[PDB]
Design a binder for this molecule. Structure first.
Ligand SMILES: Nc1ncnc2c1ncn2[C@@H]1O[C@H](COP(=O)(O)O)[C@@H](OP(=O)(O)O)[C@H]1O
Ligand SMILES: Nc1ncnc2c1ncn2[C@@H]1O[C@H](COP(=O)(O)O)[C@@H](OP(=O)(O)O)[C@H]1O
Ligand SMILES: Nc1ncnc2c1ncn2[C@@H]1O[C@H](COP(=O)(O)O)[C@@H](OP(=O)(O)O)[C@H]1O
Ligand SMILES: Nc1ncnc2c1ncn2[C@@H]1O[C@H](COP(=O)(O)O)[C@@H](OP(=O)(O)O)[C@H]1O
Ligand SMILES: Nc1ncnc2c1ncn2[C@@H]1O[C@H](COP(=O)(O)O)[C@@H](OP(=O)(O)O)[C@H]1O
Ligand SMILES: Nc1ncnc2c1ncn2[C@@H]1O[C@H](COP(=O)(O)O)[C@@H](OP(=O)(O)O)[C@H]1O
Ligand SMILES: Nc1ncnc2c1ncn2[C@@H]1O[C@H](COP(=O)(O)O)[C@@H](OP(=O)(O)O)[C@H]1O
Ligand SMILES: Nc1ncnc2c1ncn2[C@@H]1O[C@H](COP(=O)(O)O)[C@@H](OP(=O)(O)O)[C@H]1O
Lengths: 207, 205, 204, 205, 206, 206, 206, 205
């Protein structure tokens, strides 16, 4: 709840809550096209049940404490569908995180019995946790976010550590750890390809 | 042009003391778990090619495999995603120093959606590739002259294409992008073998 | 409060305003086959006028006066259709318009749902019921549910336009929007002339 | 066929003291944010053409931009939606006096869905445009003769096409419709550059 | 509380059908007349009652029903008569030729929608709810359930009232002669289906 | 070597058309009758000659042509008459109602193919090559080119011969009454197109 | 609460399976047998109880289970046996060849619908509600949840009753020999899938 | 090329004292309940063929039906699924000893999706089949020479194709698979006649 959500303008005040080896990251934007739709919110969690919700201003190009986390190679950044978050973060702040774990890719490599790899479905199946998608289609650029917006934004990062632990168990069980690591290693370049103009192209397809 | 046809393996590596080798395969089809490797083609880029027939059930070819495993030799493919899969499935070795002219074309020939080898050879080299023998019995005990010449044609021009694509990648400042794609390409081939050949592992849905 | 009229507004006493919300109801989406049945208006004050248009009716002077008045912005949701049927029926094409569908497509970039019900729910927390959309709009006597539906289509457009204007300004798209609104009458004319299925600007 | 080839810009406007100029562009692809402007072609309609090679990183072209900004000169394009976008993106100036033969074709050649320049030139003028060089490296330091002839053919006939389409627009009483379309075209190109290139802004859904 | 008379094979007589128009529907084992037999024929005079006639496997005759179907003084009202006409003609060898179809009528009058199903039409025109739950059931069963019997009856209980409304709309929009021509071709459209053209719009360019 | 008489406005008289069936085709500015005007009407008596009639912008009458179109003792033969009937009725205010359509006949007889265009039918049944190059041309041109005129004539030169062969096949496969009912509805199918149903198969379930 | 016996590796014995027909289903990590391992085999004698057998990663034999699968005197009942047969033969090396499939049976008899899933069939023929919630779950888990165990049992608890009804319908519609032939080919259809034709209808023209 | 044309039936079985017979049909179309059987073609594989015109309403063809019922004679088809249906529909006898070159192609030519008789004849035999007469009036009282040659060409090569496919089925160890497909083929044809022609009975959905 709000007792464990901290809301910031522009950047984290410091990294006191992020002296950790992995951080859960998500974004909210005005849409899915980074060259048109600005970054509006960045959400973080340490995995301790709290979240930081950082409002990004129009035209903002810097956030040194957040960007230090994104650049710190000793901290794994956990995303759900990091392909998008990596693109908007690199586009906005000029830094592409390069140590990452993605729960969507992990799901596609382990939940081979379904085609539903969205966060809501994964949190339901793996954690019995209910995620509401209601605030996803809202004005994330508003000067003041609603309480429902803040709690929705925070819920997208509160569970990614636990999902990562379970997916790592499954990847070990099915002997796919090196496959997953190679996908994660390429994911920042997949994001770059999107920013450069190949967002509709599977670069590995025959045609 | 000279085309040397071999059974099982190269006799030696005397023509392949080189830094990059052009490689293609022919099979009974596109499903490596069903369709066996039938031919491996090589060229040093000198205008000659080696066409190696692979027997049913064959799982070794020491001279060929030495080249495929040699980290100091770049293996040049057109659509290496497939060739890497069938080579690793057959011989147990996954090359990890590669250049793929299809990926290179997709990163440089941004004005077209035609990234096949025939189209690329015609545009960049004014070389005409015939596709007629693509649909043939590559498992035949004796290949026809047309099969042999088609198989050789798939590797005779890859060095020249690689040089041009490298120029374009530099010109448009996409060298690090291409290198990352080539670095992931063996794992993309691995994903295909393990059961994800119909899945873009990076797509949202 | 909904005021129901036969044929035309009795007068323009309620419409000495800078902008008027407009919608239509018809027998379907093909102006050459499907007649104009209803024109709805609102001044923005939470009341509406619902004008039943008779089969074969060729004029409505008070309504056409508003539609032709260049000092009054006509607000539509998907004006592309309303402009076509109004011009086809009464012979006058409005040329000072604001369309909340176009404005939504220029500002609600986070969704592909640009219908009026979705927009009212999101921006106003107003629930639009679509149940009476598929009904006999040519009926001699409209049902209360029809009348309330038709009015609901115009009662909120002023409030939507104010919000969309703020977003257009925030994202610096005011002049893009203005140009789209400027072309919308000719887009409607293109539909009437036989290009309704053609994006005239597409390559193919 | 006299084709004058320039680096960067026209040397002067001596050939373009005219009321309408035919304009085309060649690029590395259809995405202006990725694919740079490589060539601008111009014709006064006298049977000659100017082919201007645009350098990578080139930000200005004062003589060409003078024509593009001159409100007394109609810029004639075939599918100006694209040309307007890449020119405005590259040099910062959006022409606002335009005629587009693709829009004119769609408003007059109502008996067909084939509105490409090759089709239009064949039907209206019995002139055969070859499309072979369309897929080529338009960023090459030296364009080939075939490339230069292709680039010129894109502009050599637009004046003649414009005259015929104007007659058909008059005959079918669609002049004001065409004029409104041409007037919105720069904003349609702007919409593309801003991120709506895949969206018919006027569609219901 | 709807009175539904269930019969084996045929109506016992035509006492309830000395009328100018009869509502007709069928139930079958599926939509392919050469494979899927006619199982049920439903009739209503429009008086709020219905007759539900179970057709046996291999049954080729039902003289009282077939008299109604052949009587040119009686308009047969269907919803999507294209199918019912086909299965009735295939089974009994008689093609009704005086018909009214509420689906065609809807397509010519409810121009503001693409939803021309009976359930949607009954809801809009009459504020009557049709349940579709029993549509996919074993219509060949020796004993139909009450749910099946009520479903079969609901298909015919409202066609007279629908026809009256559609006739008013056809007159208002001046489409009576258009509809009449469509109804007159409908038996031949059904015949075309039986002959092998069921997947072909015979009037299409391609 | 083929006699093609070109007229402006109308036939000068009916001297060449004291016959029991006439082949008819149209050319227009496109497939939308409300936007795309009738530009040409072509006729042939079946004697290897053709009349090509240019129709002016806004022209609404053509008394000799319309006498033929209205004459119930003269069958009008079309290929895809569905369209020709629509534009002719739209322009001249008369709907021909004694018609034969070689496209419908082909669909009812050439059951082994889905290629029912005039070029394919002429090649298969007559070994006659029809060129389509001039189909996409400006049929409103004040002066038609020789190639346009020959194309327009070729659309009507062979319809009698096609009709005779299709009538043999309809007889052989016993589909004459089916074809006749299709031809009888075709004017109303054209009317439906003009009234706003040109994209709707009025007989489809959905 | 249903009696469900949960086993590790194999049935302890065949004492509950001295019967003429056994209901069989499987659970796996997915639909690709060369990637997705067999995790569970479920059995029912038809007495309202089930056996749920957890199959370990890398397990290559299950002697009692395979005895049933290879017993030509015991009909193996599946719903969509095409998949179960493939994963069973791939895992244990034995292809059952005396089978009945309720999915094929449904396609041959429930001709009035295109919904041939187990849930829809159980709802219609038995008024039994199958929940599909646990279908997407980690079937490889060391400890299956009670929800998983009940779901896995529900897939075999009703197949005897369905088979009885479908045999009645196949007889009513005179399709017993067609159905038998389909069941006899089903093992080879599963083999074709394992060999690389899982996406190919081997009998299609193209 | 000797083609013997008969009315109704073979005059005798003198040319068919053989272990395998090549069979094809021609019809008025693909719907056996509407489109009658018009022609039945036979070849012993000796490079000659018999073309049997079947009359409208003909219910009997005793010599042909003797061959179709003879369990000592394999009936070779290309796409026997259809021919089996129209033959059983017309004469009441379903052959149950069959070989189908289309099924055999799908089981062996795994490198292509082109399994038509023309493609197969060109690849395996270098024989060119013309499809021109396929769309013709097969019900004509007098077939043209081109029709008769087309119908003969459909059976003249099936023995030679069967031999090659039998070699490939052996090579790839798929003989039992093919045999089971051929043994279900009559029931697949029966399924089509009973009303399942648009349904893959084995599909999940
Ligand atoms: N191409 C895409 N398709 C769908 N969602 C996308 C997307 N690109 C980015 N997203 C966003 O990335 C996340 C996808 O999550 P999911 O897999 O559950 O659909 C969502 O963000 P949020 O989680 O911040 O709402 C979604 O809005
Ligand atoms: N999914 C696929 N689609 C098309 N070709 C594929 C393929 N997988 C492998 N290939 C083969 O990889 C090469 C693709 O080449 P291209 O891009 O020109 O189509 C071809 O081999 P060959 O070059 O040996 O004929 C082709 O047979
Ligand atoms: N091509 C079209 N598609 C859908 N609705 C259309 C339409 N053309 C006109 N309309 C009508 O214009 C409005 C579109 O609204 P929306 O964007 O919410 O779907 C609706 O009118 P009403 O608001 O009067 O019902 C609808 O009936
Ligand atoms: N979305 C698009 N689709 C197709 N062609 C496009 C295009 N955008 C720009 N073009 C280019 O605009 C012109 C379209 O021409 P056409 O209508 O004849 O197809 C071509 O340029 P060029 O004429 O310089 O080759 C084409 O390369
Ligand atoms: N091609 C078809 N598509 C859908 N329904 C069809 C059909 N052919 C026949 N029917 C049946 O005709 C009626 C269609 O009605 P509707 O338009 O409301 O969908 C239904 O019968 P019932 O009304 O007896 O259930 C339906 O089962
Ligand atoms: N919807 C449509 N689709 C295709 N052709 C159409 C058509 N409507 C009218 N036509 C015209 O009707 C005729 C159909 O011919 P076909 O069956 O050979 O394609 C052609 O005329 P013309 O013969 O005068 O060129 C064609 O131009
Ligand atoms: N291609 C496929 N499509 C859908 N389900 C498939 C399938 N292959 C195997 N299955 C499985 O076979 C059964 C199909 O059931 P249905 O016909 O009701 O959809 C399901 O198993 P379970 O019954 O054990 O869940 C499903 O998981
Ligand atoms: N569903 C179908 N699709 C295509 N052809 C079919 C068919 N059913 C039957 N046929 C006929 O079966 C043969 C298929 O051949 P192919 O595989 O080469 O396309 C052809 O006959 P003919 O060979 O006698 O002409 C074709 O006319």
């Amino acid at each position: 709840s709000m007792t464990e959500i901290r809301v910031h303008q522009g950047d984290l005040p410091n990294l006191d809550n992020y002296r950790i080896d992995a951080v859960a990251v998500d974004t909210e934007t005005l849409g899915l096209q980074p060259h048109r739709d600005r970054l509006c919110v960045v959400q973080l969690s340490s995995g301790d049940g709290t979240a930081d919700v950082i409002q990004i201003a129009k035209g903002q190009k810097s956030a040194p404490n957040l960007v230090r986390l994104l650049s710190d190679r000793d901290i794994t950044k956990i995303f759900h569908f990091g392909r998008f978050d990596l693109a908007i973060l690199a586009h906005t702040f000029g830094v592409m995180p390069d140590v990452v774990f993605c729960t969507k890719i992990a799901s596609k490599l382990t939940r081979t019995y379904t085609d539903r790899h969205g966060l809501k479905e994964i949190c339901g199946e793996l954690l019995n946790v209910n995620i509401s998608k209601q605030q996803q289609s809202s004005d994330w650029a508003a000067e003041t976010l609603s309480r429902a917006q803040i709690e929705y934004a925070a819920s997208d990062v509160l569970y990614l550590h636990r999902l990562k632990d379970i997916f790592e168990e499954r990847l070990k069980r099915e002997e796919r750890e090196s496959v997953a690591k190679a996908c994660f290693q390429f994911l920042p370049m997949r994001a770059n390809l999107d920013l450069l103009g190949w967002s509709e192209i599977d670069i590995f397809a025959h045609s």
